[PDB]
Symmetry: D2
Subunit: 326 residues, 4 copies
Amino acid sequence: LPNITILATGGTIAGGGDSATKSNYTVGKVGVENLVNAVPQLKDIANVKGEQVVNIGSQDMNDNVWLTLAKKINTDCDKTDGFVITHGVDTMEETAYFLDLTVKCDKPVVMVGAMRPSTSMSADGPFNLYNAVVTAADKASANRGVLVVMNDTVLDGRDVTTTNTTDVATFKSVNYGPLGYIHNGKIDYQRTPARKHTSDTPFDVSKLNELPKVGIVYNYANASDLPAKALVDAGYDGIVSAGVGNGNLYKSVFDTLATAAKTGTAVVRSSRVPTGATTQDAEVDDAKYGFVASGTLNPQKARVLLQLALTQTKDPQQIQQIFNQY
Amino acid sequence: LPNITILATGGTIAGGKVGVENLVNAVPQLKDIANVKGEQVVNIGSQDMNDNVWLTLAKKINTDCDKTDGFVITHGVDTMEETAYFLDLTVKCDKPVVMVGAMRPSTSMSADGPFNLYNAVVTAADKASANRGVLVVMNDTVLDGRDVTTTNTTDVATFKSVNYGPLGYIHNGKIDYQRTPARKHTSDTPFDVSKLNELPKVGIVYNYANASDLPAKALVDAGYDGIVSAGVGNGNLYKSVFDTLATAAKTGTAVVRSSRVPTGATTQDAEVDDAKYGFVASGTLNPQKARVLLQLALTQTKDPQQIQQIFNQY
Amino acid sequence: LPNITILATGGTIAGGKVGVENLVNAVPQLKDIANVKGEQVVNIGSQDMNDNVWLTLAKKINTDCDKTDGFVITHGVDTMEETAYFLDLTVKCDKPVVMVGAMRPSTSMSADGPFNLYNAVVTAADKASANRGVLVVMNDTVLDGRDVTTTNTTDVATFKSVNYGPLGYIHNGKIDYQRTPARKHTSDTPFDVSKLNELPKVGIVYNYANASDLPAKALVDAGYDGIVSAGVGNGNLYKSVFDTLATAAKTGTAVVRSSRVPTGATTQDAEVDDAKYGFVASGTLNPQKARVLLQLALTQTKDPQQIQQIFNQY
Amino acid sequence: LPNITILATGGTIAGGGDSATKSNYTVGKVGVENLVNAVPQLKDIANVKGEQVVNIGSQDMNDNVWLTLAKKINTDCDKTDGFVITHGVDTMEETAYFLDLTVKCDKPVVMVGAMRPSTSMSADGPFNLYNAVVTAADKASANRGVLVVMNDTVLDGRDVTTTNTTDVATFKSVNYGPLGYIHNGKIDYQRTPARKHTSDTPFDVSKLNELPKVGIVYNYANASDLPAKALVDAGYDGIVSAGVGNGNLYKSVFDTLATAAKTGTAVVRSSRVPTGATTQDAEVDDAKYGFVASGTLNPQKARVLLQLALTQTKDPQQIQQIFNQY
Ligand SMILES: NC(=O)C[C@H](N)C(=O)O
Ligand SMILES: NC(=O)C[C@H](N)C(=O)O
Ligand SMILES: NC(=O)C[C@H](N)C(=O)O
Ligand SMILES: NC(=O)C[C@H](N)C(=O)O
């Protein structure tokens, strides 16, 4: 039986409320031991060791917790057969991707959460955790990058996103689909991400105490340029536009970001549209403005890759190539 | 044959550089189904859509309701969902208003605009289309203005009512309607923009890991009437954004929680005590749609309980 | 507190080997929302669901309408969509009938049955749930019986109204309803099974490349009342199946074209001249749902024009 | 500029009606020359050569047309840089998979169709054909098995299915998602199928003049066993069950197929449910009955693979391993 290390960060998976049938709960409240012991069947499939890294709602996830997770996995790689990270849903898609690009360990890292607290009727957490361990324990799960496991499905860290505010089925890889489905503790993998990840990336956070500052501005009809200006005035290293349609920008926001791109701020166009690439060669001449197109990376995922890109380079043509490879 | 007025605003259906009369002329079969008259309102990319154009459309439809049997509005894709809901809430006319656009310009191969426009006229001309609110007609599908949204950056099939589904499907120039929106719309709303030349200022701040509070604070510093939060999961906020908006809500700004998540309601009774913070939960309204309703709510009340009631009825 | 009757039929929610009283006792919070009484009708895998059980359910609900405030039916997943539509068309009771099942048994980890049952009771107890036809409640979603279908072999979120969307979503024990089925149902249909001990024989044949005609011919040889074709694309037929069913339609068998394709209507005015062949086009009804309506149509008429009318109204 | 060979079989892509704005049409009517000449932009990207193989509605697709396509592609492999097959929508998913398992040629084979006839307003055919040639022309398209290209998307032959009766967007890979999206005549591939295809399969139809007889029976409430019996009585080689839920069968149908499996007929359980695997280890003890579970293969696809399996073997355990590998 493999050795599996659960790194706990909080989330609703570790959350509780007063009633099995009322929606009110709080988060990252129960400890890693409690979760494990709630799933005795884990003994059938793994020797599980739990460690509490933080205990927070993933709505409060942040760069320092990402640094700690990356360093820890890379540090402790030799001591275990794989990692499960228990985490809230809200920003799982971000942390997954950060880890997808910064872990160098060749053992599976599988992230997991729940939409219902442990106390709720038909809570999803227990089986989700079980399945995350199955996955981390499967030899065939290696060399697929960092994963998320929810609702019987194995998802790659890059494409995976939450699609619904409440559904147990929220996590989908919305552009290229899942890697594998889980049934009866076994996985039939039929896909692997082609974009470079983990040890094929140049990103190394081992000696980083902070990450480049990147903020996200939303576009909409009659959008204020004040948010963008505020990030410019603060000397942000980069800005991601949550564009409309195929990464389009309101004229005010466009004008502000075009000025900033000239001064040296990195500007990535992404889109608020939930599926599909923000493309080159549509309505915005990126080359002319010095902007980068995000491809299928949603704004928050684009921020993740931009911060990491910014650790290697400030040159927009090089940042674009990074956005084309990872 | 019914009389249908086409109000043109631009968009890639018009690529917005072609005039309304050119668009009509390009689809001669429109005369088989309506007597079409075209008026140019503006001619822009909808990524530059704004409050002034919104007010102009609403007033025009309301003023000209009696001179026609139905309206089609040619518009860009990118913010179609925003204009549609705004008109859903402010048009007082009982006659069909159908918005339409295109993902490809009419010079591209297999250009979608011509048949899209045809179907939008079919819809606007169909008796059965009245009393269903403002509609968007794309890819053979009639969609209500409240729920409709663009789901893909490039797909001709992008427009979807992602929470509650379409109203009807169009085949061979006819619609089988099986659904109508229950939320109150058009003449059942109190919003009346007939005399307004501007709208309350409402901005949208995004949430993500490690989010800066600076965008929220910049809207507060400018005295924005309202701030919508594109929250994470079920409308949650990064702590520094939460702190900023908690202050704002008790200091003369209305604050709506919505979600960056593409489907599902931002609910009450989850992790945020909205009553405690003076916040309004947006339900199924996404950030940009929530902004629309907030702006219009603020024409009526600054009372956050009354704003929430509005968000529970429209 | 309303009185709710649970009619049990089996399914994996009962894994069907557990009794109704066991299922009720397993969710004590049901008493917070209703006075629940359980009756066992049968206890089977819904893959063995049949005409006799359908008739029993319909008669029971119709007979007992006045003794209760609402019904929940515990049922298997696999043919839930079929039983739901049958009851959608034959129940005459004005009170909510809500069907429910589970993908995982009670003993399995994160078993879905208990909360599913809770929610189905919430639904059946809600005033607002009346007059919406027969409902299926799964994964926090209220779905009409006409459009609902299972979309995945194992996913707890499998149940979806794939053409027209859900009616409402359930959060914290309350439903925000935004939709109601337009097709006529329950007391607005003519179908009355009160006196029937059997139904017209209706079978289904599949289409694919190189399809044999032998299945179709075997139902014709048995004198079946009707055949539904699970067509390819927009309800098309493989030539040898087409030839067989063309004969059957003029030789005393009713023939409905539906589609193996999971969404979208089988339409008239595409590649098959239904009037020429004496065929009926199923619309959005999938093959198993088309069978339901055909059987019930054949209790009223064998005239294929009247059958098509029925298919255009229910 | 690459040499690309279009093999035309008919379909609505080659169909026409009297009105641009009415739904009535007939199929497989226009010739390959007309289609090509309707898309002059193809000269920008390829030297296209057309040949008419058949001109039929894909609703009448059949084994002999499959054999002719496979042999032809295998025969003519050395003479061209890749193949586009113009084909109806209705059974494209079947022909695609057959070809996915029997083509041995290492050049791209890309299938394509249209939901609207050429005569219709906003007809989808032209750009569809263009994009099919782009794909067949792209070096990076090789070694991915047989493809389908519709609505700007590149799809693998195995998972691809039609999901709606009329929508231009119908074609989706519903379990594992697409391989690549096309924009501005370029593809960003991020996936490739893991199941064995083309030259990695043992199936060789070069000398076959017919295929093993395999029929499909549907399950539903009160299902008749007469269809299944009729295929048994005719000595069919195999039978595919379009099962309910996770490949379950009505008792009558179950009893008939269980008897047949004992006599030597190959029985594959599939499902009428549009997504997800028909699994082992659920309600049916396949080993006990001698049945084969189809995995994510829909009934029509399962038939394609069962016919080909039957060319190598009649042994259920071997057929199961084929269903686990291809
Ligand atoms: N269901 C969840 O886990 C949501 C929670 N707010 C989180 O992200 O921590
Ligand atoms: N396809 C389109 O219409 C996009 C364009 N930018 C618009 O929204 O005006
Ligand atoms: N999950 C289930 O209920 C499946 C079971 N075979 C049934 O339909 O009865
Ligand atoms: N759209 C199409 O091509 C449908 C046609 N019946 C076919 O499959 O040939």
